[PDB]
C-alpha cells in the first residue's frame, strides 16, 4: 500500500489510515507527548516522501486530514 500522507510505502493502516513507518511514529510521538508546532509559512507546506520533515506542523495537520486522532492515545507502555 501507499502512505496516504506522503506517498512512502505503507506497512498497513495505522491509527486509521494507510501510512508509513515514518508517519505512524511522527503521529504517535506528537499525540503521545501532545506537541504543538508552529510553521513558517501558512499550512501550505508541501510534504511528501521527500520534504515531510521540512515542517512538522504541516505534517501532523496532513495526518489529521486523512484519519488518525485519538486511537494512538494508547497511554504509556500499554
Amino acid at each position: 500500500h501507499i502512505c496516504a500522507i506522503c506517498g512512502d510505502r505503507s506497512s498497513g493502516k495505522h491509527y486509521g489510515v494507510y501510512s508509513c513507518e515514518g508517519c505512524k511514529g511522527f503521529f504517535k510521538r506528537t499525540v503521545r507527548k501532545d506537541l504543538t508546532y508552529t510553521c513558517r509559512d501558512n499550512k501550505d507546506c508541501l510534504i511528501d516522501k521527500r520534504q515531510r520533515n521540512r515542517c512538522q506542523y504541516c505534517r501532523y495537520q496532513k495526518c489529521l486530514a486523512m484519519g488518525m486522532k485519538r486511537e494512538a492515545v494508547q497511554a504509556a507502555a500499554a
Binding site: 512512502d8 516522501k49 521527500r50 520534504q51
Partner: protein, 86 residues
C-alpha cells in the same frame, strides 16, 4: 543555494563542496569511522531528499564525486591538541 549531493538547500561548503547539513554530517561520520556501506538494490541509486536516507553506499559515492574531500576531515594538523585534553 543547492546541495550538490541531494539537491536539498545547501548551508555552504563542507569539506570543499556545496552541500546541505545532513550530507555534511554524514560525510564526516562516514570518513571518521572509515565506513564501508553496501548497496541493497543496484549500486546506482539517484539521490534526492528521500533516497539519500535510503542508500548509504550511494550517498557516499556521490559526496565523493561532487568534490567533498576526506583528507579535510580531521586532518593531522594542530588543533589535534583536543586529543591532549584528558
Amino acid at each position: 543555494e543547492l546541495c550538490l549531493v541531494c539537491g536539498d538547500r545547501a548551508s555552504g561548503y563542507h569539506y570543499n563542496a556545496l552541500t546541505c547539513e545532513g550530507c555534511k554530517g554524514f560525510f564526516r561520520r562516514s570518513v571518521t569511522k572509515s565506513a564501508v556501506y553496501c548497496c541493497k538494490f543496484g549500486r546506482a541509486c539517484e539521490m534526492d531528499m528521500y533516497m539519500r536516507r535510503k542508500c548509504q553506499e550511494c550517498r557516499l559515492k556521490k559526496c565523493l564525486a561532487v568534490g567533498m574531500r576526506p583528507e579535510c576531515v580531521v586532518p593531522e594538523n594542530q588543533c589535534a591538541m583536543k586529543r591532549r585534553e584528558k
